[PDB]
Design a binder for this molecule. Structure first.
Ligand code: RTL
Length: 174
């Protein structure tokens, strides 16, 4: 019945940059087109004294040569007039790691258990997203409570990304 246009997706009301600080463990993922981080993904969100948020992401990526680098990614976030929607500039500490600029939307979080991020890299002419990625973060390395799980699938369906996530392995590779 409802809207898959990106312009219509609801995000986190009055997103608190500081309450989202710290370690988030990626539990689930919806991959974009091309090369992306595979597994072992752990982000560290941070806010300095002026309200600027940054993050570091750690994760394993398989490069064409068939490398298995544990990428150390850095992202800085630019605020928009929506508190839960950011522009994220990112780069690897290694030169070979992918650099870019993506939207970063906090679709929902309760700050202490779960987060849902989304990024549409490209919009179709109808307003829907032709290439997106999404992550489901957990405060706990062992996942989400049945409770958090129900809300998170609700949100996935809302993002028109239901049934398009795969679980993330964490086996200490990095
Ligand atoms: C920086 C950053 C993030 C995104 C990282 C990406 C998109 C990395 C891609 C790396 C690639 C494609 C390497 C290829 O060799 C997420 C959203 C986790 C939040 C934390 C900060």
């Amino acid at each position: 019945e409802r809207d898959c246009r990106v312009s219509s997706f609801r995000v986190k009301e009055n997103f608190d940059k500081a309450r989202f600080s710290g370690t988030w463990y990626a539990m689930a993922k919806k991959d974009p087109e091309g090369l992306f981080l595979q597994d072992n993904i752990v982000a560290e969100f941070s806010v300095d004294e002026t309200g600027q948020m940054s993050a570091t992401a750690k994760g394993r990526v398989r490069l064409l040569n068939n490398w298995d680098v544990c990428a150390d990614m850095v992202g800085t976030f630019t605020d928009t007039e929506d508190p839960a929607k950011f522009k994220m500039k990112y780069w690897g500490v290694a030169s070979f790691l992918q650099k870019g600029n993506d939207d970063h939307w906090i679709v929902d979080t309760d700050y202490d258990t779960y987060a849902v991020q989304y990024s549409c890299r490209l919009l179709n002419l109808d307003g829907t997203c032709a290439d997106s990625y999404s992550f489901v973060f957990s405060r706990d390395p062992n996942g989400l409570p049945p409770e958090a799980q129900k809300i998170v699938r609700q949100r996935q369906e809302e993002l028109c990304l239901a049934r398009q996530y795969r679980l993330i392995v964490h086996n200490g590779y990095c």
